[PDB]
Design a protein around this ligand. Structure first.
Ligand SMILES: CSCC[C@H](NC(=O)c1[nH]c2c(c1C)C(=O)CC(C)(C)C2)c1nc2ccccc2[nH]1
Ligand SMILES: CSCC[C@H](NC(=O)c1[nH]c2c(c1C)C(=O)CC(C)(C)C2)c1nc2ccccc2[nH]1
Ligand SMILES: Nc1ncnc2c1ncn2[C@@H]1O[C@H](C[C@@H](N)CC[C@H](N)C(=O)O)[C@@H](O)[C@H]1O
Ligand SMILES: Nc1ncnc2c1ncn2[C@@H]1O[C@H](C[C@@H](N)CC[C@H](N)C(=O)O)[C@@H](O)[C@H]1O
Ligand SMILES: [Zn+2]
Ligand SMILES: [Zn+2]
Ligand SMILES: [Zn+2]
Ligand SMILES: [Zn+2]
Ligand SMILES: [Zn+2]
Ligand SMILES: [Zn+2]
Ligand SMILES: [Zn+2]
Ligand SMILES: [Zn+2]
Lengths: 274, 273
């Protein structure tokens, strides 16, 4: 069976690079039960605080590579190296909040502290997986620490998220009040990233053109070097699987998969033994 | 004989598609720094702009949005941009229609033909010291008629806030003829447009455009050329009679045009007529 290019760019030219879609597994057509958007949207009054005088900002006259950058210091330090990749010592377990530079800062738009706001740079592909529906894979090698893409969708309250029936594309920001990003109806390429028990990207909370603490933006960075063709995936979290295990089990195929039918049934047998 | 100095390589700090350098060959005035350059409109208090994506009217075009089926063209009467992104010659410059560009809700691609203003500055401009009008903005290249030049960018304020403020030299009144009245004040926050002087023979016109939102209280102001512009020509629009009817006591128009309606000589002769 051939692997056919079925869409040149699922983002319709809104990203820095195209994101083609292929399917070499089955007859499923290019997904169109959603609206691709490249930045977060709202479907009710969110009215994000964009008061330019409320922004914390830096006075750097260099490229913000020094430790004196105020925006770096809000982030604990700037975690981006000269190439725009997270430092090796970046805490991948509990990532800090990143405050990138913004339109109030005295620095230039190409300073060293603007990775996420500059958007997608790697070549990604929407593709049909063997067992997990659509997935996202890399069309190039990707060094550890590289920005991949943002988790984009519909900004909704936690109260609205409880009312909704489908939470397969719901990212909980886990804040004031808790807000969420629902990519079910509006979303970007990130809505297609599957859960992996052996993940190779991590989500990081980031602030850029606003600092409304209700709405961090989710940025995915590679947690290791990634090879061309590798599926990208992050750990959806135990909380997701404690809910979804009742309906479906993990198909990541990892030798250490934690949420497979086999892993679940082995645990039940262990608990019944004891 | 003073010579011209380059005093800033880019007053926009890399926020526009192209640099906008600043030169001075007239006096000792340094690069202006009594304001904050911003490439897009800002807020300093809540304007509650309607950004609900479901309120966007939008088109269902698969083509490049050149057909008369494009609802966005239809909301704009028609799409007024030719294949190269320029306003059609029959565009009404006296009474421009509202332009509705395509948006994130449209089914079309980001490169369709109805996205000129949202794609930003493409012409090369230069901030420079003029002889009698302070800072001005001139072209570094031929600019054919109908070309988008730049947006009038600044701080969104209410009608009430505008009346309180003292300096109205950088205040663009959106001239909302229906409901709530708002202004763009580029005094404290603004882009290259804050430096565009008045000309009685103007070569650019302001057009009210909607792009990522369709809150009719907050049109965005887009400058398009009204004639071919040669390299070195100063850019300028018509501030309107209401401006010079106020400012003429303190200064008069220094555009030097034969058509000048606001020079000292024009004022005197008109009253004699
Ligand atoms: C399709 S999005 C991936 C799955 C989705 N993960 C999340 O929300 C979620 N939030 C956060 C993380 C994750 C993985 C973090 O790593 C750290 C954080 C960014 C501070 C907050 C999730 N978890 C759920 C549970 C119950 C019901 C629905 C759920 N959806
Ligand atoms: C530095 S901005 C240039 C001057 C500024 N022009 C404007 O506001 C203004 N509005 C409109 C235009 C202009 C030039 C138009 O051509 C068409 C329109 C967009 C429908 C409405 C102006 N002159 C004023 C005098 C007194 C009080 C406030 C003023 N604001
Ligand atoms: N590790 C996994 N094992 C089995 N199914 C998965 C796994 N990860 C994601 N999925 C499926 O994908 C959904 C989550 C989506 N955000 C991912 C895109 C999805 N694969 C699609 O084709 O639209 C889940 O509800 C599952 O249906
Ligand atoms: N046609 C003109 N003749 C004389 N002065 C002008 C003219 N047009 C604009 N100005 C001056 O410039 C102000 C308008 C500004 N938005 C333009 C930039 C200003 N020239 C500056 O140097 O910052 C007016 O209040 C005047 O001080
Ligand atoms: Zn800095
Ligand atoms: Zn900064
Ligand atoms: Zn910076
Ligand atoms: Zn697994
Ligand atoms: Zn259209
Ligand atoms: Zn449209
Ligand atoms: Zn279009
Ligand atoms: Zn004049």
């Amino acid at each position: 069976r051939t692997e056919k290019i079925i869409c040149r760019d699922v983002a319709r030219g809104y990203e820095n690079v195209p994101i083609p879609c292929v399917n070499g597994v089955d007859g499923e057509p290019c997904p169109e039960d959603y609206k691709y958007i490249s930045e977060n949207c709202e479907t009710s009054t969110m009215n994000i605080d964009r008061n330019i005088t409320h922004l914390q900002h830096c006075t750097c006259v260099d490229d913000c590579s020094s430790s004196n950058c105020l925006c770096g210091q809000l982030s604990i330090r700037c975690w981006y190296d000269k190439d725009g990749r997270l430092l090796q010592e970046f805490n991948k377990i509990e990532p800090p909040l990143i405050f990138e530079c913004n339109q109030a800062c005295s620095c230039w738009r190409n300073c060293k502290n603007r990775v996420v706001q500059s958007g997608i740079k790697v070549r990604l592909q929407l593709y049909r997986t063997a067992k997990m529906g659509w997935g996202v894979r890399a069309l190039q090698t990707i060094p550890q620490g590289t920005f991949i893409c943002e988790y984009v969708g519909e900004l909704i309250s936690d109260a609205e998220a409880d009312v909704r029936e489908d939470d397969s594309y719901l990212f909980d920001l886990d804040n004031g009040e808790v807000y969420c990003i629902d990519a079910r109806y509006y979303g970007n390429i990130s809505r297609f990233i599957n859960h992996l028990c052996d993940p190779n990207i991590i989500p990081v909370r980031v602030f850029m053109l606003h600092q409304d603490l209700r709405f961090p933006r989710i940025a995915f960075f590679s947690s290791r070097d990634i090879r061309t063709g590798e599926e990208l995936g992050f750990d959806y979290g135990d909380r997701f699987w404690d809910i979804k295990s009742k309906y479906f089990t993990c198909q990541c195929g990892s030798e250490k998969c934690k949420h497979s039918a086999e892993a679940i049934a082995l645990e039940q047998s262990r608990l019944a033994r004891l």
